[model samples]
Every structure is written in structure tokens, then in C-alpha cells.
Target: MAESQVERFTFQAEINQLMSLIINTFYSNKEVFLRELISNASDALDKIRYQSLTDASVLESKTELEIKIIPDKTAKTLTLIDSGIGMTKTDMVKNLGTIARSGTKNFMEQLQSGAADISMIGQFGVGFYSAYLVADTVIVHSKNNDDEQYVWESSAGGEFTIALDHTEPLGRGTKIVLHMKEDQLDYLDETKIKNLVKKHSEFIQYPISLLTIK
Candidate 1:
């Protein structure tokens, strides 16, 4: 037996405009994107472990849930990697491109209804878009249970493209690469990145690691 899939629809112009405004204006604190991504990683790890309860084999590697930050000053890039439930190419498009999640819809409604709460926006699923605040270009490399590793890259202006990853597999997880802007280069500092993680995600269930070049 095979599963049936339905064709997805495109977002309405109003929804797209709303998303653009939220991503461009609503997030005032740029650093919050780091916290948001880390929180998302933590959630993914929790989900994977929860599924492992019935199938012990899901714990095959005994690899702990963790987040790693690798900064390349020369390349002017910061890569955040995590060993959690990675997304497939389809997930990347639906999750990153379109406004498919209910949280997104709710946030838009709240803003439209003039009952918008900036804090509640974070509570919703809009955190991922916060990455656009700092990086002019963003790229994601992910590997999942059913598919080979792939790469997805996008510019802040709305268009995005995906391609097969030629690099080694991430074992099983997601890696987000942020191409820093001239002003956002501060994120390249290992100490700064580590401190930010410690400050915001110290209570996180998983360990956070930061790697810097000598």
C-alpha cells in the first residue's frame, strides 16, 4: 500500500505581503534569530527522542542531541549544525517558502485584527524568518530518514532554490549556513556566539558547542 499525496496551493498575495512585513519589520532584536533557531533545534531533538520510545533502533548511534556552531572568519560565514530531525527538500519549501503552518496564520490574523503582541509572535512559528534579519543569504543542508542530503539556499528578497548536496552526509540532521553581512560580522566571533547561546539557551535540554579556527 502507498500513501496518497495532494497538490499544494500557493499563498495568496495578501498572505505574502503580510509575511514580508512580519519578517522585515516585526523583529526588532536581531540576535533573537540565534535563540529562535537554537530553540527550534531543541524541539526537533525532543521530537526524535519521543519517537525512539517504541523503536529502540532509533538510538543506534547513541549520539547525544546537540548544536554546534562553526565560524569561518575567512569565508565570512557562520554555520550552525544540529543532530536532530532534519527536513526533506519538500519540507524545506513548505516550511521555509510558503506560509503553511497554523501558527503563521494566527500571527497574521492577530496583527490584522490590531491585537498583535510582539512576544506572542515569537511563541508562534515565525522565528525561522528571523534569520533574514541578519543574513543577506541563507543556506540549509539537511539529511533525513527517507532522503539523501540536500542543500537549500535563499536570498532575503523572496526567491529560493534547492540542489543536491555534493558534500558528506551530516549523519542525520540539519545544518544552517548564514552568509554574514558587512555589519553582522560580529556573529563570527566564537566567544560572542558562545556567550549568546549560554545566555539564551542555557536551560536547553541539549548541549551547545562552538568551534572556532586557530
Candidate 2:
């Protein structure tokens, strides 16, 4: 890929503060990270479902309306994937855009004022950052009908990178893999993950399946 083909940007300074809130707010209930993620997946899937309603052909060959969780022991990685409404290259920066692009000064003030909702994420569309709770690194692969496939990588280290991807492409939707921290390895345990999903996302409308690698 040429320099002209790829795009790069750094998270604002307030990003560190927002991350502090996420870490502190969910520390006691670290499992909520999964809930936030799955709930977000459901929302994405819902958007596509609704789109298909108006445009029957919106969903071409893929019609599996479910969330799949794959825990890879060998890689020490947990992958949450959904056949949801994927984003375009332009959409990467806008993801949870409110938190990403919102004026950091105002957003930080809101957080400091304690006016921000700490528990209920996705309200501002930035719940995606919850991944940093237990992951030392996060990798997102997404493909949308309107844009080419892309890969977004971040370590919550105050910076993230996104670029066009041609390898291991998904026909549509988003795939997120979390590189679990050593102490947070429990997340890779199927039973632990099941309990978290059941407790936090049972009310979720979509089918959430835990896929085992055989």
C-alpha cells in the first residue's frame, strides 16, 4: 500500500482520561466488557436487519443473524464477530465517533463533572473502548458494502492505526479480537465467558453463540 492509500490519526489527549474512566468504572465488573461488546454487535446487526427490511437485497449471500465468539487458546485471543452493518474507510474515524471526535475538552469536563454515564456505554457509541479493559491489544477487521475492507489496530496507548486490507477479508461485518492480558486470561475460558454473557446480555435480542475451536 502506498502512503497515499493509507490513513493515520492519533487519539486526542482526553482519550487517556476517557480510558481512565472506563478502567475505573468497570474494574469491579470486568466482565461487563463482553456485555458492552456483544450488545454493540447486536446493535450493528440490528441496523443491517432493518436495512434489509427496506432493501430486500441489502444482505446478499449472508443471512445468519447471530453473534459468534471464538476463543483461541493457541493465540491467547478471543474473537467476537457479527454479520452487522460494516463501515467504510471514512467510517473508521467516526466509530463511537462521539467519543473519538467529540471536543476532548468538553468530553473531559463532562467526565470530571460526573455527569457522564459510566456504566451504560454505547449511549455515546464509544463503548468500543471497553475492549482495553482486559486486552493489551485490540484488532478490528471490518468490511462494508459501501467501502473496501479495513483493519483498525489499537493498544489504547493513546494512538490507533487503520488501513485498507486485502488479506483475510470478511465479505461483510466486523470482527474484533482481544489479546487478553496475562491476569485477565479467564476471559478465554468458555465457562467464564458464558457466565458473563448470560448475566449481562441474556436480554439481548440476537443469538449469541460461543464457538469452540476443535
Candidate 3:
């Protein structure tokens, strides 16, 4: 299963510098980028876990709270998938548009804007944009509880596009595919994912896997 279709839109100038930095080689190593993505995966797992405490139906079809990694050396792609609380079409606009503040952050803010829960708001950076560090193109497949499946794609060239991924069915969560830059192909190595998880994401609350490395 795969899906992609496109209609484009411009990203705000606020994110141009961040995008430009990665494209122009501001980072010598993409260590942080991997960490951030895993961190996000962990956060999303928590969201669904917390939501389940009240409503069990949020589990839909994918009930596992695990993050899976697919490393395809032949295609030069690195994919990450999680079974957690996904985001809606509106979430795609607000979260992906902000880059720094993804749908997860905004959803948390809206969900816990309560008196005692105000301080519980977590800070999520536009770090999602870090996908540009290793990928020439990043594709996000997500299915929120309130909306059907959708795909968001961007080369971080000051623009992005989101379209329905009608080909593949998603239960409830997110899937990210990074089309690796030729030289950044090391990211797809099974050894690299294992090392990165050990180095940067060992403490993540959820399970992080390099499931399809071979």
C-alpha cells in the first residue's frame, strides 16, 4: 500500500530560514532530526493512551502503541509508523503549517487548556521540519479520529501539499516516509536506527523498532 496526490500551498516566511538552514547545510550531522521524530512518536503514543482512559473506541483498528521503522536501502527511504492519536484535516493545516508546533502540540493545548491542566502543555518544536535534514521529500500519512486518511508531502522548498491517500487505509495514527538524499543514505541502515535509538531515544516511553531493516 502506497498513496500520493498533490495540490500545493506556500509555507510562511517564518519557516523559510529553518528550511533554508537545513537545505544549505547548517547541520553537519542529522542526529537531532532522528531524535525529534522518535520523541514525537512517543508523545503521540501517550495521547492515545490518555484518551483511551476515557473512551476505548479511539483504538479503532490499530490497538498497539508501538512505533515501527522501515529501512529500505534499495529505495533510499526511511519510514516510521505509530499507532496513536492521529490528526484531522484541520490539524494538518494548523500543525504541519506551523512546522515547529505540530498538530500534537495544538491538540494538547486545546485538550488540556483547563485550569489544572494548563501547565501540562508540552512544548513541541517545528522539529518536524528536521525531516528535511535527510530527506529531499517527506511524506506524512495520517488518519485522525475525526477525519479520514490524508497524506502531506513537502520538499521543504517553502511549500507543501496535502491530498487524500485513498489507496492505503489507515486505522488511527501517523506514517512518515523520508525520501533520502543520495549522500544521506546512511539513515536507512539498520545499524544507524539501532544506534540512534540507543543514543537519543532510549528513554522514550514507548517501544521504538527497526522492524523491516533487512
Candidate 4:
């Protein structure tokens, strides 16, 4: 492995505010954090499926479209990997750095007025932030077909970093590792994950596998 080339970035003002709301106020159903992530993975899988249809070059690496759930008890981390349409450096910064559609102010006003609907947060394009609901830190390792692997990491502390990964390549797609909170380690349970998938994401097209590492 080579030295990592890491660059730090502050979350957009709105993103910091949005994250506070989601993690502190609106995440009453913290279990839905898994649902939001799986939904995002499914969407990424859909993108690759569509792209590979017209451009076979995208399949040069791993071609299977699947999501893997890895819960490490010893490490106290929950990892989710998806072989899907991965993000380039720009995509990583743009997609994860800010809320996509609505502004934080609007979301805040809705909450102030008691009109905040937790289920509708996904529609605002801030669902990814939900990972903070159960994790103190989130790290993402992603490899796009056209670019080298990169790692994005943050502790929901108003700043994040992007690094050029010199470690083993992910081959193709994104792997998200959530350093679970002490109380949230229950997410690391296989039975809980299996039950959650059955309850929430049973209809997702791609296969979802739970990787048991001894």
C-alpha cells in the first residue's frame, strides 16, 4: 500500500444543519437507516444495470449486481457493499457533500411548524445522512469503472475527507462502513439484519447477502 493522499472538506453549512436534524431530532425510527442505505444501493445497482446495457465496457471488472451486508462484531462496524454504478471523485463530492434538492432552511422550517414528515426525508435527498443516526463515523470506499478507488470518511463532525486509496481495489462499486455506536451494535446481529431486510427491502431486485466473517 502507498501513502494515502487525503483532502479534507467541510460539510456544506446546510449539510451540517441537515445532519444535526436527522441524527438528533428526526431519526426516531433509526432502523430506517438501513432501509435508506439499501434503497440507495438498489438505485446504484439500477444505474449500472442500465448503463451496462448500452456500454458493455462498464463490466470490465466485477459484473455481478448484488449487495453484501457485513457486520463485524469484534470491530463494532456494519459494512454494506454494493456492486453498482460507483462514483467518481466529483460525484462523491457533489452527491455526498450537499443535499440534492431541498434546502436545509426549508427542512428546518417544516420541522418548526410541526410539518416535518420523517418518511419524506428520503424525497429531500438527505437519506444518506441517516447513517449518522446509528454511527459515530462513516467511511466509504468506492471504485468507479473509469477512475481509481477513493475513500470518503466523516464522523458527522462538520467535516469530511476524501482520500486516494492505494490499498486493494474494491474492483467496482461502493462499500460503506459504519462504525456503529455502542448502543447500535445490535445492527451487527445477523438475525436482526435478515429480519430487517425481509421487512423493508424484500422486493429489491438484486441479491442481498449477509457475509459472516469468523
Number of the top TM-score candidate: 4
Q: Give lDDT for model 1.
A: 0.73
Q: What is the Cα-based lDDT of residue 19 in candidate 1?
A: 47
In angstroms, the error of model 4 at 185 is: 1.3
**Residue-wise lDDT of candidate 4 within 167-191, one digit each (tens)?**
6677899999999989788888878
Candidate 2 off by > 4 Å: 1-6, 20-26, 96-118, 123-125
Best by lDDT: 4
Residue-wise C-alpha lDDT for candidate 3, range 142-172, written one tens digit per residue: 9888898988888887888889888577788
Better of 1 and 2 by TM-score: 2
Candidates' C-alpha lDDT: 0.73, 0.75, 0.74, 0.83
lDDT of 1 by residue, 1-214 (tens): 8443323334444445544764566454568768877887888788777878877666554366788888899988888888887888787767776645557777777867768755455677677766766777888898766677778876645466777786767877889988887778897787888788787797788888888888
Model 2: colliding residue pairs: none
lDDT of 2 at 156: 68
RMSD (Cα, Å) for all candidates, in order, is 5.7, 3.4, 7.7, 1.9
